[PDB]
Amino acid sequence: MLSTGTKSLDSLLGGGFAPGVLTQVYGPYASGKTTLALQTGLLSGKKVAYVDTEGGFSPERLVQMAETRGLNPEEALSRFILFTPSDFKEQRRVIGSLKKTVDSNFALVVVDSITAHYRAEENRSGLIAELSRQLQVLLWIARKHNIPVIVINQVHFDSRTEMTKPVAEQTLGYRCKDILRLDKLPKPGLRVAVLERHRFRPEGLMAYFRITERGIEDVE
């Protein structure tokens, strides 16, 4: 398991993110999903392939996080191999490229994210297979290197049964064996993660944490 650097999140997850599987981490902005990604990558100590289509990655934030934990920010920042497909086109190309870019030097892959394009109506029909293309390539990458692939997305949309509770789009949903929902508590920086889906850890369980200058910490 790839530790989150948080006692609660690790307890909830059986130790950290699982190698060889896609863990979806979804929630609203500032929910702490990106910080979680940054922290897991930072503490792994090896390279992190980070596909940032949403511009959610912040060098300064990682530097802050690295320093505040006495880690040497230059090396930390250097371990983050970035990809900025951003206009959601070279995205699949980037993920495809990842097949050969990712080697045994990598400890983690992070995709952020893939779920908002110009032609709005898109969402239903067609494109859905292209998403499956990507997810499959990511699962392939995760399995060949036995490392975790964190898939970050925004909350509320893909669970159209009726009670969109809350995001899990069928096969695409089951594409991710582990699923963590991050919610905001009404106190500055206060959050809770809910393990909605996991392979062996009890589901529905939660872990409270707070977003601080050091990244993400266990609550007081």
Side-chain angles (χ1 to χ4, degrees):
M1 307 303 236
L2 217 195
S3 174
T4 59
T6 312
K7 212 270 179 180
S8 62
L9 290 171
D10 284 354
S11 291
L12 181 65
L13 292 166
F17 291 91
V21 301
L22 299 208
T23 298
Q24 167 181 216
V25 178
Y26 75 94
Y29 294 95
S31 63
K33 57 190 198 289
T34 306
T35 308
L36 213 209
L38 269 184
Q39 180 154 134
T40 303
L42 185 260
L43 308 177
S44 70
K46 312 172 197 56
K47 295 167 167 218
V48 174
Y50 201 116
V51 181
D52 195 12
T53 325
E54 196 232 293
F57 178 88
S58 175
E60 287 93 342
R61 187 60 171 119
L62 181 77
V63 172
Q64 181 174 225
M65 297 173 45
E67 283 172 333
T68 320
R69 306 164 82 97
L71 277 180
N72 180 346
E74 297 279 17
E75 305 182 317
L77 185 46
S78 296
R79 280 182 291 100
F80 277 75
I81 310 313
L82 304 165
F83 300 83
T84 44
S86 307
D87 208 277
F88 46 74
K89 24 225 52 175
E90 69 162 326
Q91 225 284 62
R92 159 105 288 294
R93 317 177 195 145
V94 163
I95 291 178
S97 78
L98 284 189
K99 215 169 296 172
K100 201 66 269 178
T101 310
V102 181
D103 42 60
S104 42
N105 272 142
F106 288 66
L108 183 73
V109 177
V110 178
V111 184
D112 185 350
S113 51
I114 203 181
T115 3
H117 296 200
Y118 299 146
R119 230 87 168 289
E121 75 163 89
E122 313 156 279
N123 60 96
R124 181 60 195 283
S125 300
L127 49 150
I128 199 164
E130 247 291 332
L131 173 58
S132 302
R133 224 82 70 187
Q134 295 171 64
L135 290 177
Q136 272 315 118
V137 177
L138 291 168
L139 182 60
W140 202 3
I141 292 166
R143 304 251 245 231
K144 299 316 103 197
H145 303 102
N146 203 18
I147 54 171
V149 177
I150 293 164
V151 172
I152 286 168
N153 309 277
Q154 298 300 130
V155 68
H156 298 302
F157 188 87
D158 290 290
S159 291
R160 303 155 45 205
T161 325
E162 194 43 56
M163 174 202 246
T164 304
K165 179 68 187 64
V167 163
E169 46 188 334
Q170 195 212 350
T171 315
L172 290 302
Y174 288 100
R175 236 74 181 223
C176 297
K177 256 48 181 174
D178 300 347
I179 303 194
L180 264 179
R181 187 187 78 229
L182 309 189
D183 297 314
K184 299 179 176 173
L185 288 187
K187 294 79 149 183
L190 236 206
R191 304 289 182 265
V192 63
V194 180
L195 191 55
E196 307 197 310
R197 183 141 88 208
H198 201 267
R199 296 121 52 246
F200 69 92
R201 282 294 299 159
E203 300 182 356
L205 269 47
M206 313 161 134
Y208 291 100
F209 66 97
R210 54 186 165 104
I211 297 177
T212 70
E213 277 86 304
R214 313 185 63 207
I216 273 169
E217 298 188 77
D218 284 292
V219 299
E220 288 286 68

